[PDB]
Amino acid sequence: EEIYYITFREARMLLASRGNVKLNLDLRKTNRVQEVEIKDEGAVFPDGTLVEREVLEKIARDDGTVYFVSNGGVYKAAIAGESGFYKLVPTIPPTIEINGIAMNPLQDTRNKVNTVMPREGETVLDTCMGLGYTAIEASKRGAYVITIEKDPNVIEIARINPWSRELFTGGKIQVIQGDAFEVVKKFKQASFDVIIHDPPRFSLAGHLYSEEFYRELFRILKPGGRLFHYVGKDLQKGVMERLRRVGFVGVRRVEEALGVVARKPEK
């Protein structure tokens, strides 16, 4: 029934600890710890499954993947599909690896969402899900979030990540699978109070930096609507330039969040 998430951190703990220990089994999502009694042949979890020393040693040495204990057995939070191999990586919080792809982390997503300050009663567009962390943070403020994910395997990996749970627990957030450049075309004009645009790097996602795309972002924003465009330069240049060309105003760097904000006029 319950899933116990375990990474190298927990396995090392259990191989080197004695008797019984209190450990966190949802990847620090909920701060709660549970007792796992240690035996010679392995560790038995709060469900009664014994993960044998063999398994814990294996995962104690593999610090590059998340594991979980579901029903009878232990499992690896990964998926083989199409031409890529995706896996959840035991960072805090977890990150996704697609064959091989990318206080620091969770503050960074709060800095991003802080640029546009989504409020209760507002609708936000998050153009590139990833694991959903920006979409979730924007929804925890009270806004209704639409978030686009191109890769159905990213969505499936998000599904077993306890940190992406709010993408799927009812509503507050709605997940569109598809191509963001094409999806935004089928959005109605003046739909969104804020847009958070966090695309892949220029060289791999040039069309998400195009005037054509920015015009679509412009069209679908409400008057007075807010845009954050991540940048992470010479492209910041064009981004700022192309956003004004398209209609945006208040276009400026936000240094903390490594991006550009903009505001659609005619409030």
Residues in contact with Na ion by the rule CB under 5 A: 76, 119, 126, 128, 130, 133-134, 136-137, 179-181, 198
Nearer to Na ion, 181 or 248 (CB): 181
The least distance separating Na ion from the CB of residue 258, rounded to whole angstroms, comes to: 13
Q: In 10 A of CB 4, how many CB atoms?
A: 21
Closest approach of Na ion to the CB of residue 107, in Å: 11
State the nearest-atom distance from the C-beta of 178 to Na ion, in Å: 8
Tokens in use for 122?
Answer: 């507002």
DSSP strands (E only) in the chain: 4-6, 20-24, 33-38, 42-44, 50-52, 67-70, 73-76, 78-81, 84-89, 95-98, 123-126, 144-149, 173-177, 192-197, 221-230, 249-254, 259-263
* C-alpha 189, offset from chain centre: 27
Smaller CB separation from Na ion, 76 or 222:
76
Measured from the CB of residue 22, what is the shortest distance to Na ion in angstroms?
26
Token digits of residue 116: 């546009």
Phi then psi dihedrals of residue 9, to 5 deg: -60, -45
Question: Which one, 5 or 38, has the nearer CB to Na ion?
Answer: 5
Give the shortest CB-35-to-Na ion separation in angstroms. Answer: 26
Whose Cβ is closer to Na ion: residue 243's or residue 257's? Answer: 257
> Using CA of residue 134, residue 126, residue 265, residue 233, what is the dihedral sign?
positive
For residues 51-90, b (16+ Cβ closer than 10 Å) or e, as one string? bbbebbeebbeeeebbbbbeeeebeebbbeeeeeebbbbb
Burial classification of residue 253, based on how many CB atoms lie within 10 Å of its CB (0-12 exposed, 13-18 middle, 19 or more buried): middle
Name which of 6 and 38 has its Cβ closer to Na ion: 6
146 vs 240, which CB is nearer to Na ion?
A: 146
Q: Which is nearer to Na ion, 53 or 115 (CB)?
A: 115
* Residue 119 Cβ vs Na ion, minimum distance, rounded to whole Å: 4
CA distance 237 to 264: 19
Q: How far is the CB of 19 from Na ion (least distance, A)?
A: 29
